Every structure is written in structure tokens, then in C-alpha cells.
Amino acid sequence: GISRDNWHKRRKTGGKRKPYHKKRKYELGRPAANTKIGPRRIHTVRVRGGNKKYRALRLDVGNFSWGSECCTRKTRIIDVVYNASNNELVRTKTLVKNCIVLIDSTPYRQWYESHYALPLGRKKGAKLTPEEEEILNKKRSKKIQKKYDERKKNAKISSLLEEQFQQGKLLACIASRPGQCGRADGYVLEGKELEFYLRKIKARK
Amino acid sequence: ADIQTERAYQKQPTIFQNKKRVLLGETGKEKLPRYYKNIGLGFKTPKEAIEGTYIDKKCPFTGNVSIRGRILSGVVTKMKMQRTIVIRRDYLHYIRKYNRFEKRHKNMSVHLSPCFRDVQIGDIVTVGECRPLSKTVRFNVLKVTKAAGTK
Amino acid sequence: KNKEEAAEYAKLLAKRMKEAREKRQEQIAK
Amino acid sequence: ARGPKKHLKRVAAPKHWMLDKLTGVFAPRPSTGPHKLRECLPLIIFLRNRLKYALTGDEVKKICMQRFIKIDGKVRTDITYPAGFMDVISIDKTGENFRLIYDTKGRFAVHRITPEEAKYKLCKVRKIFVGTKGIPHLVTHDARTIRYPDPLIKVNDTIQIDLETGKITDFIKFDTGNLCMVTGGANLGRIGVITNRERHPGSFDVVHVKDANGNSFATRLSNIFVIGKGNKPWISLPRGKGIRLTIAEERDKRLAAKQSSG
Amino acid sequence: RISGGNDKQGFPMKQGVLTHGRVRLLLSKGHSCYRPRRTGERKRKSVRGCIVDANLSVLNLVIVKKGEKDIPGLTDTTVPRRLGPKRASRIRKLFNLSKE
RNA sequence: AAACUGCGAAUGGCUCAUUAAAUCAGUUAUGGUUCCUUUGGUCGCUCGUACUUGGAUAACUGUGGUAAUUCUAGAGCUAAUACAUGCCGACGGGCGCUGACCCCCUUCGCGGGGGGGAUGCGUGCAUUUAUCAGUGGUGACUCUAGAUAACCUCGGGCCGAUCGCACGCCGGCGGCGACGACCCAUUCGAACGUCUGCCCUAUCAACUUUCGAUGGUAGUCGCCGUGCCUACCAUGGUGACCACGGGUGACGGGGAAUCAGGGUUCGAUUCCGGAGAGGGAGCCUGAGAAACGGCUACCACAUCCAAGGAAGGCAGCAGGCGCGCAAAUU
């Protein structure tokens, strides 16, 4: 029976407002969708006009975009690490819009290696499992190898992104409203936005 | 100054700022394009809005508001809110029985963009009607004309 | 019907754009 | 209050229907359709109050369910179907075609047209927009969606529509010097040549129209409907040619006609 | 099989109610012991729990397995029956007809 | 006939209790939203049993329970434009990415330039996110359209398993309709905003701000804009141009009576807008209701009872009671 009406509020002058009508159906509100990280659970809501809203109650997968490389991937949502609105929303690990999440980087790592030899970090270490060295070296005709060689020119990943890829988790921002559309979609944090949010997360501790 | 004075990163949603960089194209700073639009009705975009760094989603020139409906005027009387100012619209109301007028007024809370520096009490502001921006704000300052006494 | 309408409008659009280009060249002539 | 209303009081009906005040409490509430509630002539009003083929609404229903009436070439059995400006009402059984047109008093006159002129109509385009993989669509005053219009056709233009196929035959641009009629306001029903359109950005444009008798008036741009290229209408006009008379001139004409007739 | 019943006041016996007495349930469309007069109507109705006890006017039983002796008024007669299948597929299934 | 399904029952009618920038009136806006129905359009634009699929359940038959209701239970059948599922074909392809391979120019060494193409993956008529370029439009879009990389809700989005009339010439076509589904177009509205206008009272002069009061940022919720709500932050916002508070035998207006001119009083009352259905509150269904001739409670009043329970809402039309100076036919 919660309501979003303006007539229960005080006036700009500050005086009380006496209601002339009781609560209307079109003025209703609904309980918040405190979308938690977990196996996909989405409840549909019949809304005004006969349309539907997708109240996502549990999500562990989101379509996040690496915008510098124009690479949108479906990824596992691992953690919630920063919320600008409420710090309770990070303790409870609630997925809302503009909340900062830790997502997986493995599909971004696959697209990373498909444009082979993005910035060299630790690639000469005591590691190299079989069956994926082909995606890095391969037997390529001279034209395709030259194409990869010229792709090497645009192999520039920010140092912070490199540390995140080493950690296996990318910082990302959820640009969707999980409690309204049923998806937790967003974009990988990079640039001054990434620096700002890293500073904020560090200063929270 | 530093526009990141909030708990969330402040940015213009239209502008994609972390495009892939180039070492030779780096000249000390990454460079940032500015999103601005011209509101209609012959109002010029201030040089501040085009070449500023402020983030204000309710700015008529760099925000997400449209100017439709009444174009009004008033004199600035309060500047004690964040990006909002209280202007006073004065008029004469005609009482027919006495064939006379009475001085009436009302105060409008209007959004003021950071693109308008040096706005003073008593300055005249041309404001444009937009969607509800807050509980009481429905107009956005489009133009500022200085008071004659300013020096 | 969709294919016929698309073809008819493609020819009409080609004719109209040719006329507009001719007017543009005549304007740049002055 | 809750949901749409379904009735229309007799005295709250549009005044151009020329309904009585003692013939019931209710007026025919026009159905939803191509034209607005207050700018339409319901089929019952046309077939009963104007043409007098029916004395009651039941007789209008009897006439309409025999499929004798066609609006724009399509048989309509809804006795409250909203028929509005430029609509062609064809009765093949009695072999007569009418076009719903405005009189200088702002009322839908009973205007008979030939079978050859019943094959088409004029429509003011209300909007043009590119949609659905780049196809230009055009919406008219009668809610007729036409795909692939001529790229020259813009808003406020008039298009001649072939009623059988619903496709554009020709078009008249909105321009100074073109004949037009007024479809709303005080000057409703007047026909004249456009002389000047003065633009008000963010507001309503005002168009000035000069009569064929020299009289000049103004309307809002939404109330203009281009009728012909130049001063020749593309459609037949009522007994009056859109020239509104003053009350003195109308009184003199009436007196002279009665003197010379009986 | 115990198929339900009616308690001493005639109130019907409902499957999911795990009490021995009577309860009041907000029955809606799709629930037993209720028939909505209009679409979306729900009513608070008294229903007897599904557990059988002494306080029952009638208990309904369905013979899911016959014995060795025929009950004199229950198993020796048969229904001559009408209203066979009406759908074409059901008709062809009953008589094992090929689609040809 | 019944019964299932579909639609309507949210209109109309009544009443004037609440309500003092609230309702309402004129004026503008939705470039900040929803929209059953009507009308026009889209409706092989998916590239991997169809000559028709599945299970039920009514009506009906039969057995019943309760003092009692428009209460229903058990059993035996049977349908769909109810419910659910689901395909050929369009279908040949084309588009983008991936490129197993093939030449020419050529300091035949040391490189770089152009065309065809097969393993493979996504295409779409919608949704969500990110990015790019700049068909049509506006005063103005972060509009429309386009391209790219993905996504695509078990409580899953469309891409017809529906129905009547009429005629035909080798293992094929087809003309009129009805109904239904998606999307667009605002027909009908609804909801929110803008501007200005409301009676008496200071024996009401300061009010609001703990429990949002004014604004900012992020979000939640909502059909959307919005302190609507939440967290954090700022200390704001209104006022003798009368705020705030109180009173009103105050629903507002069109309007009515009176009126030389100016005015004074009235407007419950058939038209428009609002509000309510004994008082509050919460909901289902639906396009649309916080509906009451819908449901769920409590409060007040009240009906039947076999005392276990069941059932209520005339400010609808008549008609009673009561109240009164005061108002008609079951």
C-alpha cells in the first residue's frame, strides 16, 4: 500500500496539505528488488497498461562491455565492491544500477588473446598449459600473420587493467536497473573512472 | 576545479572518455570532448558551457533537460542553494471593483548552471520551463542580464 | 507488394535525388 | 473517472451537429476512428438529421446493416462511425456520393459529388517519419499510414488519395498563393488563398488567408488545409464557395431571394 | 481411495489443509470448494481439513482395487455409456487407426 | 435451453461529506508517460504430425453433505478462438567476422600492395548494455533511421494448429469475409507539470526542518518527470505583497437573483471538472478501479441460525423509518 503521491508531502511554504482523495491505484509503489548475487531468479511484475517488469531477485550473470576494445561479453558477476548511494548496499551485496562490481575476466581474456600479444606482462613465466598456445602462435599464412603483426600496433592495455586481468576479476559498473529489466548489464571500468573508483574503494577501507 | 566532489563518478553520459589511447597522440593530457547543445528560441550557448569542465545533468546546454513552454523572467533574490537560485517575479493584479492594482509577487526556485558565473542578487534572469527537476524546481536559467548597479 | 513498393520508391528516390543534385549544381553555378 | 467515458450528453455535443435540446438527454457518442470527437459527423446524424432517410436511430441501424453506406469506399455498419473532413460517403443503392465538407458557418454541409469525384479524396499529412529499416511513412489527418511517399511531400502538405488503393496520386505543397480551407476556429469553413505564414518558434504558427472576395482573415497553422494549387480547388465546393457573408449581406440576400422566389 | 468428504456442518474437505478441524481460506480461481462469480474474485470460505476423523457427515471412497466378491449394487452392473471421442486424433487413437 | 469461452460490468445514475493554490477556470507541456476499442499500416524480412499435436474440464449422467446462501464435494464421459505445445515452407540465399588455400608487382634474398574462396560463428520484424558515423525531423534530442559487439528473463516476445459463403480445367492453386496476435500511428482518454485567479479571520506573526523541511549526487520504486522514497551532503525554503494556523449552514465553474453606473448576494441542484459510496485501510481482475449493485479485514450498526455457522451496505429507481418549517408512485 506504499504510495508515490506528492500530496502527502508538505508545501514549499512548509504548511500541511489536507488530502481531498484517498490513495489511487496509479500512485502505487512496490517493494524494492534487492537483487542479490546468486543463481538466476527473476519474478515478473504486471504493471500499468498490462505490460511487464522483470523483478530480478538473484543474478550471477551480466552482459558487460569492454568499451575501449568494443568487446561486449556475457560474464559472471563475482562481487559488489562499491556503492555510491548506501554502504549497506555493499555489505548486503545488492545489485543496483551504478553499483560497482567485480566481474570475471576470462571471456575478455579470450578476446584478449584472440588479438594475440596484447601488452606483455608475465608471459615468460613457468606456465603454459597445452591446448591454448595455438591461439597465441598458430600456423598462419603470411597475410594473416601480417594482419596480426599490424594488430600488434594497437596492443595497449592500461596498467590498472593489466593488474585486474592478472587478478582474474575486472572492475565494472552496472548500467542496467536489475529490479526493473531483470538484467545486470554494464561496462568495464577503465580510465579516470577506474582511477576514481579504485581510490574510493581503497579509501573505504 | 576538481569536478569529482561526490561519491559517484561525475561524467556526461553522451561522451565516451576512455577510448583507446595512442602514445604519440598523448600530449600531457588525454583530452576530453565536451557535450553541449543549443537550446532553441534563439538562446546562445555560453562560452562557459562549451569550454567548461563542470558536470550538471540539469544544465540546459550540457544536461538532459528540454526547454518547452513558458519563457519567464525575474530578479535574483537568493543564491544560497546548490545550483538553484530563488528569483522574485513581481506583477500588478487588477481589482475591478476599485479599478486599481495591487503589487503581488511570487518566488520561483530555478536551476542555475555553473556555466553562468558572476550572477548577483538583483540580476535579471530569463528562465525556461522544463520538466520537474526537483520538488519545486520547474524552470532553468537560460540567460543572465546584469543589474545596472553592478561594478 | 513489399518488393514492388520498394522498387518503385527506389526509382522515385533516384529521380528525386538526381533533380536535387541538378538544382544544387545550378545553385553552385551562380 | 475510472476508465473511458461512453456517453455524450445532448447539450455537450458539438454544436455543428445542430441537434435539438428536447429530443432526448443523449447525443450519439461518436466511435473512436479517423477523426476527433468534436470534428466529426457520426453516421446517424448524417443519415437521419441531414439526409432524413431515417426518422429514428433504429432506422439508421436498419439502413447501415444492409451495407448500403460506404465511407471512403469501405462499407461501415457502425451508425456512430466518426466521419469527418474530406470523407466520401457513397450510397450505391440510391446512387449518390457526398463529400463531408465544411460550410462557412462551420457545419458539415450536404455536398453532393459526382461518381468520378468519389474515387479520391484530399488528406493533409500530419507527420512524416523514417522508420522500419529506412522506409518513409506519412500519417494524414484521417490516420491513414502511407509508406514510400514522394520525398518532396512534407508536413502541412495535401495529398490526393485514390480511395480504392489508398495511394498518393498527386500532392499540393503548403505555400503562399495556394487555395486552402479553414478546419478549425472562428474562420472554420472559409476558403481562400494563403498570403503569409508568420512563424512562432516554440508556439503556434499563424497563417493569413485572403478570400476570393478580397476579405482577409487569420488562423493557426493546424487549422489550414490546402485545397488546390493556386486558386483552383482540386475538389468541388459547396453552394457557397467558402466566402463567408456578413449578417447584413446574408439578410439582404435572403430577402432578395424570397422576393424573387415567392 | 479417500477422495474427500463433508464434515458435520456440510463444509467440504480440502486436500492441502493438514488440520482435523475447520479453517478459513481465501479461495480464488483454480481452488477447490470455490466458484468465482466474477473474474478475479476471491472469497474467505470455511473448509474442513483433509485428515479423516469421527466428525464427518460423509466420507467419499473410490474403489481403486476390486476384491474377490462383487458388491451387490456397485460392481455387477455397467454403464451402457455414450459420448465417445469427439476430437479426430482421439477417435483414431481409440480404434488404432493409421493416419492414412 | 444449459455450460465453457469472449466482451462489458471502471459508462450511466445518485450525493455534496471531505476539500482554501487544494478542487476548479482559462493557458500551456509531456522533447517526462500509459492507452481496451475504432481507423490506417506492419504482419514468408528467424537461414537450424504440419493434410492439424497434447492433457484436461464444464455442460450432461449419477452419488451426496449442511438448519441455512447465487455453498459445493465425490464419481463416469466430452469439446474449444479455454489451456498448453509445436512444424514443413519462405529457403535460394545474402550480410558481417573467421580465412584451410590460389596470382601478379618484386632491389629473383632482406618487404609491402589486389581479387575468388571452403571447417566455423552470429544474422532477424522486439528487449537490455556499450560503441561508432551522421535517411528524415524539431525552436531545441541523448529524436527517427543506420552500423558494430553482445544480451535476450523457467514468473520465456511476435513471426495465425481458429471460423462461415461460393465456384474449377491435368499428384497443385485461388475470391470474399469473421476472429485472433506483435509493433507503429495519441482516436478515446487518463496521469502529471507551467502561468494567473479563491471566502472570513492577527483574540493566528513568524512557520518548516528529530519522523523530508529547500536544494545537490547516486540509486530504489513508479507508467514516467519529481524528496515519491532511501543513503550521503549542503542549510536551506515561505512570510505584513499576510506566510503558518484557525473558521466556513465552503465541492469549484458555466451560471442565478438583483442591478442607472459601480456593485451586493446566491450557485446542494439536470452541463463540465472533482470527491465518495456507513467510517477507515488493503487488494484481485483488468486497457482502465485502490471499484464497493467486486473481494479482504477492523470500527459502528444490523439480518438468519437447529448456536455449529452464514450473510450485509438505497449519497441508484420507487418505497418505509427518523429528522425536521421543509420535498411526490413500492
Please report, for chain D, the start and end positions of each structural domain, with discontinuous segments joined by +: 1-116, 121-171, 174-244
How many helices and strands in chain A, by DSSP H and E? 6, 9
Give the helix ranges, DSSP H, for C1-30: 2-29
Residue-wise burial string across A67-85, b where 16 or more C-beta atoms lie within 10 A, e elsewhere: bbbebbbebebbebbbbbe
- Residue D23 CA to F18 C1' — how many Å? 37
- Residue A1 CA to F283 C1' — how many Å? 9
Strand A186-188 versus strand B71-78 pairing type: unpaired
A20 Cβ neighbours under 8 A, 6+ residues apart: A7
Count structural domains, chain A: 3
Q: Which residues of chain B lie closer than 8 angstroms to A156, CB-CB?
A: 20-23
Burial class (CB in 10 A: 0-12, 13-18, 19+), B71: middle
Distance (Å) of CA B11 to CA A191, A197, B3, B117:
12, 13, 9, 20
In single-letter form, the type of residue at position D49 comes to N
User: A98 with A111, same domain?
Assistant: no
Distance (Å) of CA A134 to CA A5, A147, C26:
62, 16, 61
- Domain containing A141 — which CATH number? 1.10.168.20
CA distance B67 to chain D (A): 9
Cβ contact D174 with chain F strand, < 7 A: no
DSSP letter string, D142-201:
T--EEES--TT--TT-EEEEETTTTEEEEEE---TT-EEEE-SSTTTT-EEEEEEEE--T
Nucleotide F29's nearest residue (CA vs C1') is B69
Q: Does B53 reach chain A within 8 Å, measured CB to CB?
A: no
User: What is the spatial distance between Cα D110 and Cα D91, in angstroms, rounded to a whole number?
Assistant: 13
User: Which residues from 6-45 of B have any strand F atom under 7 Å from their CB?
Assistant: 6-8, 10, 12-14, 16, 19, 35, 37-42
- Rounded to the nearest 10°, the torsion over CA E36, E40, E46, E48 is 80
CATH topology of domain D121-171: OB fold (Dihydrolipoamide Acetyltransferase, E2P) (2.40.50)
Note down the domain range covering A26. 1-30
Describe the crossing of helices A159-167 and A192-204 by its angle, rounded to 10 degrees: 60
In sequence order, the β-bridge partners of residue D193 are D179, D210
A199: cell is 581510490
| Residue A28 DSSP label | B
What backbone torsions phi and psi does residue A169 show, to the nearest 5 degrees? -125, 135
User: A38 with A128, same domain?
Assistant: no
CA angle A158, A164, A169 (to 5 degrees): 145
User: What is the spatial distance between Cα B5 and Cα B7, in angstroms, rounded to a whole number?
Assistant: 7
User: A184 with A94, same domain?
Assistant: yes
List the single residue in A with minimal CA-CA distance to B136.
A12
User: What is the spatial distance between Cα D18 and Cα A170, in angstroms, rounded to a whole number?
Assistant: 74
Q: Which residues of chain A lie closer than 8 angstroms to B14, CB-CB?
A: none
D80 Cβ neighbours under 8 A, 6+ residues apart: D28, D29, D30, D31, D42, D43, D44
User: What is the spatial distance between Cα B31 and Cα A173, in angstroms, rounded to a whole number?
Assistant: 23
Cβ contact E74 with chain F strand, < 7 A: no
Q: Are D192 and D180 in contact (CB under 8 A)?
A: yes
User: What is the spatial distance between Cα D230 and Cα D179, in angstroms, rounded to a whole number?
Assistant: 6
Cβ contact A32 with chain F strand, < 7 A: yes
User: Residue A154's closest CA among B24, E56, D44, D131?
Assistant: B24
CB distance D151–C12 less than 8 Å?
A: yes
Q: Does D202 reach chain C within 8 Å, measured CB to CB?
A: no
User: What is the spatial distance between Cα B140 and Cα A15, in angstroms, rounded to a whole number?
Assistant: 26
Burial class (CB in 10 A: 0-12, 13-18, 19+), D128: middle
User: What is the spatial distance between Cα A188 and Cα A199, in angstroms, rounded to a whole number?
Assistant: 16
CB distance C8–D147 less than 8 Å?
A: no
A195: cell is 582511477
D160 Cβ neighbours under 8 A, 6+ residues apart: D120, D121, D122, D168, D169, D170, D171, D234
Q: How far is CA A1 from the centre of its chain?
A: 32
- The structure was resolved to a resolution in Å of 2.7
User: What is the spatial distance between Cα D149 and Cα C5, in angstroms, rounded to a whole number?
Assistant: 10
User: A100 with A46, same domain?
Assistant: yes
Q: Which residues of chain D lie closer than 8 angstroms to C9, CB-CB?
A: 135, 148
Burial class (CB in 10 A: 0-12, 13-18, 19+), D42: buried
User: Residue D101's closest CA among D113, D85, D89, D88?
Assistant: D85
CB distance A98–B8 less than 8 Å?
A: yes
User: A120 with A161, same domain?
Assistant: yes
E6: cell is 463433508
User: Residue B139's closest CA among B131, B129, B149?
Assistant: B129
User: A59 with A148, same domain?
Assistant: no
Residue A135 neighbours by CB distance under 10 Å? 11
In sequence order, the β-bridge partners of residue B92 are B103
Strand D158-162 versus strand D167-172 pairing type: antiparallel
What backbone torsions phi and psi does residue D72 show, to the nearest 5 degrees? 55, 35
Q: Are D261 and D253 in contact (CB under 8 A)?
A: no
SS3 A6: coil
- Residue A17 CA to F299 C1' — how many Å? 26
DSSP letter string, A82-143:
E-SS-THHHHTTEE-TT-EEEEE-HHHHHHHHHS---S-SS-SSS---TTSSTTTS----HH
B29: cell is 593530457
D60: cell is 439508421
B12 Cβ neighbours under 8 A, 6+ residues apart: B34, B35, B55, B62
Long-range Cβ pairs for the range E21-28 (8 Å, 24+)? E21/E48, E21/E49, E22/E46, E22/E47, E22/E48, E22/E49, E23/E47, E23/E49
SS3 B119: coil
User: What is the spatial distance between Cα E42 and Cα E36, in angstroms, rounded to a whole number?
Assistant: 7
User: A122 with A204, same domain?
Assistant: no
Strand E43-48 versus strand E22-27 pairing type: antiparallel
User: Residue B122's closest CA among B82, B151, B91?
Assistant: B151
Residue B8 neighbours by CB distance under 10 Å? 17
Strand F nucleotides in reach of protein CB atoms, 7 A cut-off: 8-13, 18-20, 22-23, 28-32, 34-43, 45, 51-55, 59, 64-68, 70-80, 98-102, 111-115, 125-132, 135-142, 144-146, 148-157, 184-197, 207-208, 212-232, 234-246, 262-264, 270-276, 280-292, 294-297, 308-311
User: What is the spatial distance between Cα A18 and Cα D107, in angstroms, rounded to a whole number?
Assistant: 47
User: What is the spatial distance between Cα B62 and Cα E88, in angstroms, rounded to a whole number?
Assistant: 68
List the single residue in B with minimal CA-CA distance to D201.
B41
A138: cell is 598458430
A181: cell is 529489466
In single-letter form, the type of residue at position D64 comes to C
Q: What is the CATH number of domain D1-116?
A: 3.10.290.10
CA angle A44, A48, A50 (to 5 degrees): 65
User: A89 with A173, same domain?
Assistant: yes
Strand A35-37 versus strand A41-46 pairing type: unpaired
User: A163 with A189, same domain?
Assistant: no
Chain C and chain D share a number of CB contacts under 8 A equal to: 13
Residue-wise burial string across A163-187, b where 16 or more C-beta atoms lie within 10 A, e elsewhere: ebbeeebbbbbbbbbbbeebbbbbb
Q: Does B98 reach chain A within 8 Å, measured CB to CB?
A: no
User: A98 with A113, same domain?
Assistant: no
- Residue D25 CA to F318 C1' — how many Å? 22
E38 Cβ neighbours under 8 A, 6+ residues apart: none
User: What is the spatial distance between Cα A169 and Cα A107, in angstroms, rounded to a whole number?
Assistant: 11
User: What is the spatial distance between Cα D77 and Cα D61, in angstroms, rounded to a whole number?
Assistant: 8
CA distance D60 to chain C (A): 38
**Rg over CA atoms, chain C:** 13
E71: cell is 458388491
HSE-up of A17 (CA within 13 Å, CB side)? 13
C4 Cβ neighbours under 8 A, 6+ residues apart: none
- Residue A13 CA to F29 C1' — how many Å? 25
User: Residue D227's closest CA among D165, D164, D127, D159?
Assistant: D159
User: What is the spatial distance between Cα D68 and Cα D88, in angstroms, rounded to a whole number?
Assistant: 14
User: What is the spatial distance between Cα D7 and Cα D80, in angstroms, rounded to a whole number?
Assistant: 12
User: A146 with A117, same domain?
Assistant: yes
Of residues D148, D151, D152, nearest to C5 (C-beta)? D148
Cβ contact D245 with chain F strand, < 7 A: no
Q: How far is CA A14 from the centre of its chain?
A: 41
Whose cell is 422566389? That residue is D261
E99 Cβ neighbours under 8 A, 6+ residues apart: E92
Max Cα-Cα span within chain E? 59
Q: Are B50 and B66 in contact (CB under 8 A)?
A: no
Cβ contact D131 with chain F strand, < 7 A: yes
Q: Are D73 and D163 in contact (CB under 8 A)?
A: yes
Q: Does D204 reach chain C within 8 Å, measured CB to CB?
A: no
CATH topology of domain B1-151: OB fold (Dihydrolipoamide Acetyltransferase, E2P) (2.40.50)
Chain E and chain C touch, per 3+ beta carbon pairs within 8 A: no
CATH 2.30.30.30 fits D174-244, yes or no: yes
User: What is the spatial distance between Cα B65 and Cα B54, in angstroms, rounded to a whole number?
Assistant: 16
Q: Are E8 and E21 in contact (CB under 8 A)?
A: no
Long-range Cβ pairs for the range D91-98 (8 Å, 24+)? D92/D68, D93/D66, D93/D68, D94/D68, D98/D46
Q: Which residues of chain C lie closer than 8 angstroms to D154, CB-CB?
A: none
